[PDB]
Each structure stands twice: as structure tokens, then as C-alpha cells.
Amino acid sequence: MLEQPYLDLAKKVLDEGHFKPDRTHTGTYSIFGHQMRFDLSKGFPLLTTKKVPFGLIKSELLWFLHGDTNIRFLLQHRNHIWDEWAFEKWVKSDEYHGPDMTDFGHRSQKDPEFAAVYHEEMAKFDDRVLHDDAFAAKYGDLGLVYGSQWRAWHTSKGDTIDQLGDVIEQIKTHPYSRALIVSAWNPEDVPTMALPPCHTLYQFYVNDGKLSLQLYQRSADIFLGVPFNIASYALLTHLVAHECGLEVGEFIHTFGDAHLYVNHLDQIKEQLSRTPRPAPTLQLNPDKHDIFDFDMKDIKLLNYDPYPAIKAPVAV
Amino acid sequence: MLEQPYLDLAKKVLDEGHFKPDRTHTGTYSIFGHQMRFDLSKGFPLLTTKKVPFGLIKSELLWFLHGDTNIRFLLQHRNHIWDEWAFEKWVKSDEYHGPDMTDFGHRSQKDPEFAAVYHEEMAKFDDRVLHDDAFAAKYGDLGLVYGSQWRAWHTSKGDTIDQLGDVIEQIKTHPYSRALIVSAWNPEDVPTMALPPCHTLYQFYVNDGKLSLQLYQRSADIFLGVPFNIASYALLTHLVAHECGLEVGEFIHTFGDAHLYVNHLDQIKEQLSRTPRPAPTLQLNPDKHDIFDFDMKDIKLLNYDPYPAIKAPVAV
Numbered sequence: 250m251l252e253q254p255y256l257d258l259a260k261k262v263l264d265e266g267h268f269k270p271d272r273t274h275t276g277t278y279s280i281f282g283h284q285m286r287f288d289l290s291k292g293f294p295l296l297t298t299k300k301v302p303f304g305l306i307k308s309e310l311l312w313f314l315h316g317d318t319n320i321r322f323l324l325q326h327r328n329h330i331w332d333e334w335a336f337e338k339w340v341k342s343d344e345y346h347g348p349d350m351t352d353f354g355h356r357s358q359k360d361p362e363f364a365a366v367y368h369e370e371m372a373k374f375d376d377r378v379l380h381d382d383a384f385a386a387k388y389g390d391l392g393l394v395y396g397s398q399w400r401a402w403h404t405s406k407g408d409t410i411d412q413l414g415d416v417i418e419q420i421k422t423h424p425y426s427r428a429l430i431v432s433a434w435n436p437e438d439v440p441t442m443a444l445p446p447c448h449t450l451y452q453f454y455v456n457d458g459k460l461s462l463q464l465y466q467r468s469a470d471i472f473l474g475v476p477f478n479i480a481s482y483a484l485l486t487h488l489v490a491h492e493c494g495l496e497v498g499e500f501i502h503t504f505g506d507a508h509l510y511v512n513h514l515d516q517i518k519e520q521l522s523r524t525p526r527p528a529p530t531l532q533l534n535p536d537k538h539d540i541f542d543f544d545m546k547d548i549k550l551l552n553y554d555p556y557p558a559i560k561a562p563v564a565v
Numbered sequence: 566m567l568e569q570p571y572l573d574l575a576k577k578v579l580d581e582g583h584f585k586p587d588r589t590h591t592g593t594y595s596i597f598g599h600q601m602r603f604d605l606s607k608g609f610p611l612l613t614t615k616k617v618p619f620g621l622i623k624s625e626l627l628w629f630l631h632g633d634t635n636i637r638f639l640l641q642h643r644n645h646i647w648d649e650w651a652f653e654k655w656v657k658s659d660e661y662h663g664p665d666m667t668d669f670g671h672r673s674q675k676d677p678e679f680a681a682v683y684h685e686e687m688a689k690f691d692d693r694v695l696h697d698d699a700f701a702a703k704y705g706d707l708g709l710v711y712g713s714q715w716r717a718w719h720t721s722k723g724d725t726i727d728q729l730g731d732v733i734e735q736i737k738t739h740p741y742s743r744a745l746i747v748s749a750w751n752p753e754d755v756p757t758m759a760l761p762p763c764h765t766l767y768q769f770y771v772n773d774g775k776l777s778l779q780l781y782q783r784s785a786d787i788f789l790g791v792p793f794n795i796a797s798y799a800l801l802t803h804l805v806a807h808e809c810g811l812e813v814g815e816f817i818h819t820f821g822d823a824h825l826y827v828n829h830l831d832q833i834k835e836q837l838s839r840t841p842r843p844a845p846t847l848q849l850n851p852d853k854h855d856i857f858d859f860d861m862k863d864i865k866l867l868n869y870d871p872y873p874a875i876k877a878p879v880a881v
């Protein structure tokens with residue numbers, strides 16, 4: 250079926266993936282360099298071998314698409330994918346008066362009581378970002394997250410470039426352009442970032458009237474990351490095609506360091522014994538065409554019928 | 566043999582490569598998305614199925630390595646790879662008093678006399694850049710060529726970053742870093758460039774004590790470009806390893822738009838009937854270690870024994 254390339258990457262890593270020490274304190278089995286591709290005319294590459302929440306994907310993408318850097322948008326749609334990053338800022342600031350929270354991610358993963366204290370504090374934070382406009386403005390704003398690199402690349406003139414909106418125009422005028430690239434990697438900022446963009450750079454290509462996208466990920470966590478990463482960019486490819494009145498082609502996923510955290514081995518294995526089902530089908534709103542103005546209800550997933558979810562530890 | 570991956574890309578493009586209109590006015594057969602890899606412990610991937618001038622590769626690389634943007638360095642080593650770009654600037658400037666030269670590349674490819682006039686003017690230019698220090702400084706300096714993007718990324722503070730020297734330090738301190746990336750793609754400059762960098766971005770990786778590099782090329786001309794592109798980055802990988810006291814691993818070559826100009830079909834075909842020979846062997850100077858201070862005589866190619874050269878039209 251459609252998702253086989255994923256399953257083959259997992260198998261691949263389990264076999265010849267070498268043990269390499271990673272930034273976190275968990276180990277990894279990894280390979281360097283891998284291309285994988287999905288034919289979007291065959292369906293949406295949302296894994297059926299485990300329930301992946303399409304909502305977190307759909308709302309996070311619109312977030313980037315709006316050039317939004319404030320977590321407040323995510324939280325209103327019950328998306329806490331980025332909470333961790335806002336919170337850490339809030340914690341080491343002068344206005345924080347409460348439990349230590351140092352190394353919170355590790356400490357919570359290691360202490361029962363702490364985790365509960367953590368969720369009380371993070372619960373407080375999420376309420377402040379939601380209601381206190383000044384708080385949201387001072388702590389919910391991440392600054393350098395995708396939607397900013399995509400839609401507001403700050404120039405040396407202090408100006409700002411809409412990389413994405415710009416390339417979409419070139420796609421409509423010079424479809425045969427071999428430079429329809431959007432990059433999220435800025436050398437001046439990357440050395441002072443908690444996490445440089447994993448999704449370094451992507452490229453569009455148009456031939457025979459159908460759109461294609463190739464993403465370059467410098468670091469991927471197979472079991473947890475990739476299932477989300479694939480759906481995000483396959484979805485981007487759809488929306489861009491919708492806008493450009495083009496047909497959908499292929500999503501090519503190139504990798505740098507593709508890895509599997511050792512604390513995920515049993516889970517990946519169990520998944521590897523499941524039989525892919527017929528991939529779901531995506532439906533974008535026919536009437537709406539400005540994908541920058543698209544909202545939740547304009548993107549639908551039909552016939553998604555996956556296997557139960559596989560819970561697994563997040564590495565630290 | 567070693568170069569089979571190249572030959573397979575060529576075969577691949579000839580078979581399912583679709584005809585796509587390109588920027589120039591020649592046509593192309595192309596594919597979007599391709600990974601190819603070479604095991605540098607097996608030898609240097611300099612094609613034996615046709616004589617590729619290692620010198621133009623070796624001297625151009627040192628050029629980039631020195632953060633040099635002035636063509637004057639190339640010309641002293643009889644390298645005219647970049648002349649075309651300096652010259653065009655010189656031509657449309659106030660100080661140019663001579664034959665029209667408009668569209669010179671095409672006009673020369675189309676007129677016998679013109680071509681001779683062209684080579685007289687370009688001969689003049691090359692002598693001025695070589696001897697007139699102010700001329701060299703005003704016309705030989707390209708400004709935004711690789712060695713600048715690599716070793717002097719201009720920041721928004723007007724400052725300058727040595728991307729390359731910086732990553733080499735991280736390789737020596739955090740070998741297991743999944744962010745050892747050097748990028749040559751700057752969104753603010755790319756929309757005002759004759760040719761945005763084809764060699765968009767590369768990534769290093771270290772495991773089991775041996776270095777690896779993966780290059781991402783957004784546009785490749787199989788017959789003419791790639792044979793040079795491969796040797797350039799395989800060589801970079803060697804020098805970086807030499808510096809870091811590491812072993813050499815693999816060169817992974819990912820592609821965006823890989824193409825074959827139709828005016829190269831007979832030539833590629835003829836090459837495809839040749840039988841690869843044993844790949845040559847590279848030797849870097851054992852005593853010298855600062856690769857930024859390396860010069861010609863510190864890099865040697867042993868046992869290179871290729872088939873005759875294949876002359877073919879440059880597309881325009």
C-alpha cells in the first residue's frame with residue numbers, strides 16, 4: 250500500500266542502523282541519507298498502521314500558513330504541540346514566581362508528584378496566554394518558528410520577505426522554475442536556537458500540469474516525528490496545488506539523520522506486524538482558493554480507518 | 566564499479582525522464598528527486614568513463630575554501646569556469662567601449678566571426694583582471710559566489726559569519742550533531758541573482774569515527790554538471806576529514822531537478838557503452854592540516870586512467 254515506504258524506513262533502520270549517541274540522553278539507531286516518495290494521486294499518506302491525529306497536523310499547518318508565531322492560535326484549537334517552548338521562556342523570566350521547574354521535561358518524566366505540579370503550572374500558563382493579551386504577546390509569541398521563516402524572513406535592511414507567498418507566485422508564472430525553494434535555515438539565528446528547524450528546506454516542481462514537493466529533513470525521529478512530518482508536507486502540497494489550479498503529484502521526503510530512539514523498539518516492532526489498510530482521501534474546499542485564508546473546515550479527511558494508537562515514551 | 570550510480574542516473578533519465586521546458590532555450594528530459602551515494606573508502610568518484618579535468622575541480626575548491634570571490638585566483642591557475650560572470654558585468658558597464666556583446670553567449674554559439682571577436686574581448690578582460698589590481702578589484706570580484714556564502718555570510722548587523730569554519734569546529738566538538746549544515750541559499754539575495762546557488766545546502770554526519778556528507782542540488786545537468794559536482798564535494802569531504810582527524814565515509818548526492826539537455830543524448834549514449842575502470846585514488850598532504858591553507862600541491866590524484874573526453878554543446 251501507500252505507506253510502505255515508511256514501514257521500509259523503519260525496517261531499514263532496525264537492520265543496519267548504527268547506535269549513535271544523540272543530543273538527548275536516550276540512545277539512537279540511525280542512518281544518514283534516505284529518500285522516500287509518495288504518490289498523492291493514490292491517496293493521503295496518513296498512516297493507517299496507527300491512529301495519527303490529523304487535527305494537530307491540520308491546525309498547525311494553517312498556523313504556519315498564517316505567518317503566525319503566537320501559540321495562542323494553537324491552544325484555541327486544543328493544540329499543545331508548541332506549549333513546551335513558550336513555557337520554558339516563561340519559567341526563566343523575572344515574572345515567574347513559583348516551583349523551580351528547572352529541566353522540567355526530564356524531572357517530570359522522572360517524578361510522579363512533579364509531573365502533576367508541572368501540569369498545574371503549564372495549565373496556568375495556557376490560561377494566561379489565552380486571556381491576558383499582553384501576556385500572550387510577551388510569552389506566547391515564539392518569534393522564530395516556521396510561519397515566520399516562511400512568511401517574514403527578516404532582511405539585513407530590517408525588512409521582511411514572504412518567501413512562501415513569493416514562490417507561489419513564481420509557480421503561477423514560471424512553473425518550470427528549478428529554484429522554487431523555500432528555506433527555513435538562517436545561519437545568523439541558528440547558533441542561538443533551542444532547536445534549529447528540522448525541516449530545513451523544501452522545493453516545488455511542476456511538470457505535465459501537476460505539482461510536486463521535496464522536503465529535506467536534517468533530523469527525523471522515525472516512530473514519533475515522521476508520521477506527522479509526512480502528513481504536514483503532503484497537505485501543504487495539496488493546498489499549494491489547489492491555489493495554483495494544478496494537479497497533485499508526488500511528495501518526496503529526503504532525510505539527513507533518520508533515527509529511532511531505542512526506547513521505541515517494541516512499539517515500532519508491534520506496528521511492523523500490522524497490515525496497511527486503504528489510505529484515506531483528502532478533500533479541500535472547492536469554493537475557497539486563497540490557502541492563506543483557509544481554516545479548519547476547508548480541509549477534510551475521508552475514509553480514515555486506522556489501527557489503534559501506539560503510546561510510547563518521548564525521548565529526553 | 567564505483568561510478569555506477571552516475572551511469573544509473575543517466576539511464577534513469579533517458580527512460581522515464583519527461584520533456585520539460587527549461588530556463589535556457591534548449592529542451593530537457595528530467596526527473597525530480599534522486600539520491601545517489603558513493604563510498605569514499607572504495608576510491609575517488611572521478612569518472613573513468615570520460616576524462617574529467619581534476620585540476621578545474623581542485624583549484625576551484627581551494628578558491629571557495631579561501632573565501633575568495635575574485636576570479637583573479639582562478640585565472641592564475643588557468644581556470645576559466647567563472648569568467649563568463651565577471652565579463653558580463655564588465656560588458657554592461659560605463660567603462661566598456663567595444664563591440665556590442667549583448668547576449669554574447671548565444672550570439673557566439675551562433676556566429677563564427679562573433680565567437681572570434683568574443684574571445685578577443687574576453688582575452689582582453691582576463692589580462693586586465695590579472696594585471697590591473699583596481700580592475701580586478703572592480704570587475705573580477707563576483708561578490709556572491711560560494712566562498713562568500715560559505716565563509717562570510719553577511720548578517721543583519723552588517724557582520725559576517727564563517728559558516729564553514731564554524732561547522733568544522735562543531736565536528737571536532739559535537740561529532741554527533743544533527744545540525745552540521747552549511748547553507749548557500751539566502752532568500753534576500755536569491756531573487757536578484759543570475760543563478761541562485763545550484764548546490765543549495767550540505768550536511769556532515771559522523772558515526773563510528775568516519776565522516777559523511779550529503780549535498781542537496783536543486784538543479785543538475787547530468788552530462789556536463791554532475792561529473793564535476795561529485796568530485797568537488799567528494800573532495801571537500803576528504804579535506805574536512807583530514808582536518809578533523811577522521812576517516813572518510815560516504816558522499817550522498819540528493820537531487821531536485823536532475824536533467825539531461827536534449828543536445829547531449831548521443832554523447833551520453835556513447836558514454837553508456839563504456840566499461841568503468843578501477844577508480845583513482847586521492848592523496849592529501851599528511852603534514853599540512855589546515856585545509857584553508859591547503860594549495861594545489863597538497864592534493865593528488867593517483868591512478869586516474871580514463872576513456873577519452875566527450876565534447877558536447879553547452880546549452881543556452
Ligand SMILES: O=c1ccn([C@H]2C[C@H](O)[C@@H](COP(=O)(O)O)O2)c(=O)[nH]1
Nearest residue numbers: 272444447468469470474475478743
Ligand atoms: O517534526 C519533527 C520535529 C523534530 N523531530 C525530532 C528530530 C530529533 O529527534 C529532535 C531534534 O534533534 P536535534 O537534531 O536538534 O539534535 O527532534 C522530528 O522527528 N520531527
Ligand SMILES: O=c1ccn([C@H]2C[C@H](O)[C@@H](COP(=O)(O)O)O2)c(=O)[nH]1
Nearest residue numbers: 427588760763784785786790791794
Ligand atoms: O555545478 C553545476 C552548476 C550548474 N549546473 C546547471 C544546472 C542547470 O543546468 C543550470 C542552472 O539552471 P537554473 O535552475 O538556474 O534554471 O546550471 C549544474 O548541473 N552543475
